[PDB]
Structure 1
Amino acid sequence: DVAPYFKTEPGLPQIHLEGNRLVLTCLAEGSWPLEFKWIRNDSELTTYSSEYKYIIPSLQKLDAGFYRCVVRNRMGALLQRKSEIQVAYMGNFMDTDQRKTVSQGHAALLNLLPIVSCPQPQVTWFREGHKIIPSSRIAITLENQLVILATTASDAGAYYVQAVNEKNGENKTSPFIHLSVARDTGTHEAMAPIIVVAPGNRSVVAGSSETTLECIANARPVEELSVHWKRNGVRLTSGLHSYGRRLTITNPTSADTGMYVCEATLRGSTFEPARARAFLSIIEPPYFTAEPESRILGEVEETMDIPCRAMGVPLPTLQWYKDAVPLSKLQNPRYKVLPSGGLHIQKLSPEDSGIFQCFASNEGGEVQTHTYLDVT
């Protein structure tokens, strides 16, 4: 009379190479007979058997997904926490050149040519065999876009990238972006600061090691451009990188949350500074504030309340299962999920015996609790 339980749990996401072997194991204990089956995303890959492992001899791209095992015995069935399986690959660039024109003095934003890859590739920008290096007038964004500030006639040319997949070592060369610069054939005058890449908003899971905001401005003469960051009106003097364009917040906590301001100034000018706001927030993963007892006894025809309550930021959503089947699919009229969390069962039936499982989740993660209900 021991309900199934897991001896071990799956851990962090894993990236695997195409062509490699994947082994998943479902290690559980409990009364005889323990049987197992496997799920990927929301499809069952196998039917119940005594086999406790799932093996893919040679991984392909669309083996990537979320894998769960289910363990059952005569008492009920229990759904395991998900394993996230990612498969490394690198596609090809389209073999067609692009064209782009920019008016002199304005920033040229050159996007990374489209390529599908897991993980995202490391990128190097080139023109005519020479690497394009970040500088006071050249920025490469966190999403590997090339930004040329205060463009001059000399910036015209054929730009391309070499992309490398860090996990499988593959490298690809893109076609060209042919950048034309339309010259200003008048006297060059100062150009006011303008934000060309704004930092936007950022949400991080509590405990994160670092997060980085990015703000890129144009002005002319670009040598007189300054980009600074402010927090509560005061200029920040830590976490600064890339000519003021990046602000790294290390081990962000609740003290760090709220608004940050990027401010771009043209020195020697009386232009108003350009400003952009960024908001940092923290996701707090779910935790239970109420779990049911591990075992509950009910009498037939009576009612049953199975508690489940969880906290987190944002407030976690709860999902119930009975014997590894979601209540949303069972559509049992007698099972009432209470908005605040618990499950209320009207008129207990012998069929209600089994394992009830409550999952709590938000963007920061998922936790689970369960009970074995014995109806007599």
Structure 2
Amino acid sequence: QDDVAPYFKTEPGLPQIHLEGNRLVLTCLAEGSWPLEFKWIRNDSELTTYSSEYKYIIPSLQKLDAGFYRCVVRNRMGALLQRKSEIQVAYMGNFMDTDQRKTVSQGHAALLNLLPIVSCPQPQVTWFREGHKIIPSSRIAITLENQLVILATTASDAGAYYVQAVNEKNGENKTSPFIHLSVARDTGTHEAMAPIIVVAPGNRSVVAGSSETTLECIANARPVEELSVHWKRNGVRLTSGLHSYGRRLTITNPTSADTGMYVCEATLRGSTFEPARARAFLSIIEPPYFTAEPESRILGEVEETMDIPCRAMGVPLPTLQWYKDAVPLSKLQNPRYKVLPSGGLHIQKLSPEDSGIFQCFASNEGGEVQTHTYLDVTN
């Protein structure tokens, strides 16, 4: 009857990373009764006013333009809110031009942290010692956080260390100042060192159906050539997915059967030392999906009870928030509406102002899904 509330024809997709200086165009393509008006919101902050323009163009991207973008479509029926889309910008700043110093006792592991640098994403790092490149070996490792771990340091390891960082999205490179490493002699007890875990695998959670995830576990011992790092699950040692001298375990395409505890066990062959063990817990997060959605339109007699269902499942439990014509009920401050723990919304006393778009957003760490309905209040 030419009284159709807006709805989106396009599903905003996955996060996209774009280079600086590039032209970016965002579209708010909806379907409903004409004329329609569109406005844009970035980080819960309005960018544009309502107009007939359905696209937002950034001729040259900047670091500030990055954020979560939304668009609001509105007509005589009400206003509808789009699912947020993450717009990331590729940028790489400089290091702070101040050299650092660090001293480590001989035989103990030395961890050199990548000097602070702002970059999205974090650049890949190539470590050097006075021009000579450092390759990961049995006693040298590079963490997922670009930390240089030198197991069983010696007097030959003293020197100025630096990196060449490269951003994998825009290709820019930056050279870091020096970390002057000094190795101090400790008295020669260090002939056989018990295996001790230096970088332990922390708790990790990943999205369902994702490509792969990688846990890291680095240990130190002497002699380092006899050091063996293994991975166990349910008390059973693993074989597939290992990388980088057994220090990285990659679980590819994890499901609900891959959740639980993974144990890192570092042993020293030919020795009676107790193996050093660490715990790591892998969790699978499920994106929210509705098991009950409100019908597209619902009639309502003035001052009569009304329940608007909205139930969603997924791990962890999705958190739900409502909107009335693209306005949160938390900021709407109306005692007429009352949120329901089971999922829906309860409105006991109606009013001619209650007519409009009601939108239920279910969100967790795995993203968000939204449903909506138009409340028609009879005369």
- Is the structural similarity TM-score above 0.5? yes
Mapped partners of 1:254, 1:198: distance in 2: 24
Local SS of the residue matching 1:115:
coil
Local SS of the residue matching 2:357:
strand
Local SS of the residue matching 1:255:
coil
Mapped partners of 1:365, 1:187: distance in 2: 54
Question: Within 5 A, what are the aligned runs for 1:154-173?
Answer: 154-173=156-175
**Deviations 1:68-121 (CA, angstroms, capped at 9, x unpaired):** 110011011100111111111101011111111110110000001110001110
Bigger Cα displacement from structure 2, 91-100 vs 179-188: 179-188
Mapped partners of 2:88, 2:264: distance in 1: 36
**Deviations 1:209-256 (CA, angstroms, capped at 9, x unpaired):** 111110000001111111111011111011111111011111111111
Bigger Cα displacement from structure 2, 47-56 vs 214-223: 47-56
Measured after TM superposition, the shift of residue 173 of structure 1 is 0.3
Measured after TM superposition, the shift of residue 185 of structure 1 is 5.0
Local SS of the residue matching 1:62:
helix
Measured after TM superposition, the shift of residue 183 of structure 1 is 2.2
Measured after TM superposition, the shift of residue 374 of structure 1 is 0.5
Q: TM-score, normalised by structure 1?
A: 0.98
**Equivalence for 1:175:** 177
Mapped partners of 1:276, 1:134: distance in 2: 22
Mapped partners of 1:147, 1:333: distance in 2: 59
Mapped partners of 1:186, 1:254: distance in 2: 50
Measured after TM superposition, the shift of residue 359 of structure 1 is 0.4
Query: Gaps (5+ residues) in structure 1?
Result: none
Measured after TM superposition, the shift of residue 187 of structure 1 is 6.1
Mapped partners of 2:239, 2:303: distance in 1: 68
Mapped partners of 2:62, 2:229: distance in 1: 45
Counterpart pick for 2:202 among 200, 203, 220? 200
Mapped partners of 1:32, 1:217: distance in 2: 65
The 1:188–1:369 alpha-carbon spacing in structure 2 relative to 1, beyond 3 Å, is: closer
Local SS of the residue matching 1:351:
helix
Mapped partners of 1:237, 1:168: distance in 2: 36
Mapped partners of 1:187, 1:301: distance in 2: 84
The 1:305–1:277 alpha-carbon spacing in structure 2 relative to 1, beyond 3 Å, is: same
Local SS of the residue matching 2:17:
strand
Bigger Cα displacement from structure 2, 192-201 vs 21-30: 21-30
Local SS of the residue matching 2:87:
strand
Moved over 6 A (4+): none
**Deviations 1:175-207 (CA, angstroms, capped at 9, x unpaired):** 010111112453642110100000011101111
**Deviations 1:295-350 (CA, angstroms, capped at 9, x unpaired):** 10111121211110111100000000010000010011101011121111121111
The 1:188–1:42 alpha-carbon spacing in structure 2 relative to 1, beyond 3 Å, is: closer
**Equivalence for 1:371:** 373
Local SS of the residue matching 2:314:
strand
Mapped partners of 2:249, 2:68: distance in 1: 34
The 1:184–1:347 alpha-carbon spacing in structure 2 relative to 1, beyond 3 Å, is: closer
Local SS of the residue matching 2:195:
strand
The 1:195–1:304 alpha-carbon spacing in structure 2 relative to 1, beyond 3 Å, is: same
Local SS of the residue matching 2:250:
strand
Measured after TM superposition, the shift of residue 15 of structure 1 is 1.0
Mapped partners of 1:180, 1:374: distance in 2: 75
Local SS of the residue matching 1:243:
coil
Q: TM-score, normalised by structure 2?
A: 0.97
The 1:42–1:187 alpha-carbon spacing in structure 2 relative to 1, beyond 3 Å, is: closer
**Equivalence for 1:342:** 344
Question: Within 5 A, what are the aligned runs for 1:144-159?
Answer: 144-159=146-161
Mapped partners of 2:23, 2:249: distance in 1: 41
Number of equivalent positions? 376
**Equivalence for 1:119:** 121
Mapped partners of 2:97, 2:275: distance in 1: 42
Measured after TM superposition, the shift of residue 41 of structure 1 is 1.1
Mapped partners of 1:124, 1:153: distance in 2: 22
Measured after TM superposition, the shift of residue 265 of structure 1 is 0.8
Bigger Cα displacement from structure 2, 177-186 vs 234-243: 177-186
**Equivalence for 1:299:** 301
Local SS of the residue matching 2:69:
strand
Mapped partners of 1:254, 1:17: distance in 2: 36
Mapped partners of 2:190, 2:254: distance in 1: 44
Bigger Cα displacement from structure 2, 179-188 vs 325-334: 179-188
